[PDB]
Design a binder for this molecule. Structure first.
Ligand SMILES: Nc1ncnc2c1ncn2[C@@H]1O[C@H](COP(=O)(O)OP(=O)(O)NP(=O)(O)O)[C@@H](O)[C@H]1O
Ligand SMILES: Nc1ncnc2c1ncn2[C@@H]1O[C@H](COP(=O)(O)OP(=O)(O)NP(=O)(O)O)[C@@H](O)[C@H]1O
Ligand SMILES: [Mg+2]
Ligand SMILES: [Mg+2]
Lengths: 343, 7, 343, 7
DNA sequence: GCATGCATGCATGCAT
DNA sequence: ATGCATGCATGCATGC
């Protein structure tokens, strides 16, 4: 339907913020959102939700939208269940050392489970954990890691969040010895088991090494592939063109530039990742607003585009991820033959 | 082409 | 036009200082500065920006000028809010041991964020970090690196500076044997993602090791190349000659020496980077001023020129960087052939 | 050959 | 060079 | 017056 026409009289900051707040519900995002919401609603023994995708595919935006929707849904019964918290969302920390630091992870997990009203959770742990007469839940450095884990699991049991979000889960792969990866993820698996809290792990394709560590681990996990648009299929090309048309209609400008004809260039330098296209269009629109230009030119798009080397690197990573994530009926027939009679 | 609602 | 004529009666120190403070806005620096400011104003999700410039290119002066301009821009706004710092820039510390130290990096970054209006923040949220009560921020040696990182992240998110400048960023590559090179940048990516502050990395061509480490890093980084003035193109040679002419007209002597006639020698001993040319001209101007010479002679220039052995290594490193940083239409076709893009 | 300006 | 957990010795607050 | 008990600071010991 296009942007509101009254934004033209508004300053450039208003138009820029409006374009920032705009979002597109393209079919892959909608399908992944519905699948994730359904899986969250009934974990059914699953201890992990591996949501992974192309760099630029908009995974974090999905996490934010899911958190907002779950909070909105929980508010009517949050009016009665004071102690509960609907969603807990934290970001994994890339460690400066060779191995992931679980102590900092536990500290930040406890910090995220912070309520300014103390009466909801008066006591959090054994000692050295309570707040310092402030909303911030300060933790003494001398508190040992297993005690911190115990306090975190007790807090998780008391609060009982619907889902625990760990954004950029690929940071868990920082370790020294090769087979230590199984222990690295088994720690989180035991945490989820005792806490009885479904964990959703989001990250890029670097976490595809996290897929099939063990039979128990593969059983406990659910895979949600955030597919990026691929030109090989005309349906994806049509969806990409529709998204480009929507972005063209919704960008605040005196006249709407024809971004559809340049879909070839856009895909090339975005690899079908909608988030990258949105960021690129945001950059170009900011450039135009600074210039107070009447329209977007191809020169403007080229000026703030991604380098060919960067796009090649992302494409190589995406190709490796999709190859690792591909399934064919031949594999199914092989599995059935291994089990027995196959049809 | 298909218009897409805000998400 | 040129230098003020009244400086001739002034002592040698004043003329030397006037030439030291003089700067030239040559076209390459103008383009790089425009691109840098346009990216800084609207990062649009870019966690990193990379500025690859040769030795003597002028990256540090560029940082000082953009810092000054951004501070001037944000000065009128500081009346409304006094807790905002426009720009913070720190130099990367070369490690004494084999590993880049992140504890000292975090400590220096936190020190650089000190403000006389300490009452506005009044707390960093971590034990062991406080004000010295007179003019300093003192950090305890018992404060662990994750605690320092948490304090720095809280300070950054409170202050929200427009850009975090890291000069001599190639020191991050000073790491032990192994694939820790990717982790060195992953930690910074995680920090910038949490604080939401664009990190600008400036360094020589040794920074190319960080260029395309991973798909995510390549996507969320912007590559800015500070090209030197090449000798293979007439436009670059003419710009170099114009810069030489400006320096000739702006150096305070009784009679302006003819330097454009020796442009080949200047290019030979500077490889086109005008920062080295300015430094060498400052040296020769001081040498002439110590004896009150009326003009610059070829012998004076030769007495302080860089050794050819030095310039051979300079050119080897410059060629190594420029070969990697180059792109042609063949790369674009190769990318699109790999893609589903028919073209 | 152009007398460039100051930065 | 730093991290991190654990043990010990000393200071101090309380109770008899 | 004072003895006891606990909390904290520091060394240390191994690992990275
Ligand atoms: N569906 C969408 N519609 C509109 N804009 C989007 C959408 N998805 C992503 N974006 C834009 O892209 C930005 C980045 O999205 P994000 O979810 O961080 O992508 P990513 O590929 O997961 N990035 P990373 O943090 O490196 O994993 C958002 O903040 C929006 O500006
Ligand atoms: N545009 C300019 N105009 C005038 N002088 C300049 C200019 N650029 C550089 N210089 C001079 O050259 C010096 C060195 O520039 P700098 O920005 O430190 O280059 P660099 O290659 O980043 N140095 P480093 O990498 O530390 O060896 C400056 O301090 C000035 O004296
Ligand atoms: Mg993301
Ligand atoms: Mg320099």
């Amino acid at each position: 339907t296009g942007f509101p026409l009254e934004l033209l009289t508004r300053p450039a900051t208003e138009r820029l913020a409006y374009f920032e707040n705009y979002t597109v519900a393209h079919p892959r995002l909608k399908e992944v959102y519905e699948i994730l919401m359904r899986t969250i609603a009934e974990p059914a023994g699953a201890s992990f939700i591996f949501v992974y995708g192309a760099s630029g595919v908009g995974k974090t935006t999905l996490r934010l939208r899911v958190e907002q929707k779950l909070t909105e849904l929980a508010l009517p019964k949050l009016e009665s269940d004071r102690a509960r918290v609907p969603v807990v969302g934290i970001e994994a920390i890339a460690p400066e050392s060779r191995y992931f630091n679980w102590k900092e992870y536990y500290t930040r997990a406890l910090i995220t489970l912070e309520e300014p009203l103390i009466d909801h959770k008066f006591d959090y742990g054994v000692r050295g954990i309570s707040r310092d007469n402030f909303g911030k839940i300060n933790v003494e450095s001398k508190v040992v890691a297993p005690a911190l884990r115990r306090a975190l699991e007790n807090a998780l049991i008391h609060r009982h969040p619907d889902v625990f979000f760990v954004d950029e889960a690929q940071h868990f792969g920082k370790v020294a010895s090769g087979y230590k990866l199984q222990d690295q993820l088994d720690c989180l698996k035991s945490l989820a088991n005792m806490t009885g809290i479904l964990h959703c792990l989001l990250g890029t394709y670097e976490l595809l090494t996290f897929r099939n560590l063990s039979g128990q681990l593969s059983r406990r996990s659910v895979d949600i592939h955030f597919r990026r648009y691929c030109a090989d299929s005309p349906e994806d090309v049509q969806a990409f063109k529709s998204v480009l048309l929507t972005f063209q209609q919704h960008l605040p400008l005196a006249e709407t530039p024809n971004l559809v004809d340049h879909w070839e260039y856009f895909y090339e330098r975005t690899l079908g990742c909608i988030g990258t296209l949105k960021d690129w269009l945001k950059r170009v629109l900011s450039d135009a607003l600074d210039r107070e230009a009447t329209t977007i030119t191809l020169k403007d798009l080229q000026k703030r585009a991604l380098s060919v080397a960067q796009c090649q690197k992302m494409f190589k990573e995406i190709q490796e991820g999709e190859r690792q994530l591909s399934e064919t009926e031949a594999d199914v027939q092989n599995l059935r033959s291994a089990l027995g009679l196959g049809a | 082409l298909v218009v897409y609602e805000e998400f």
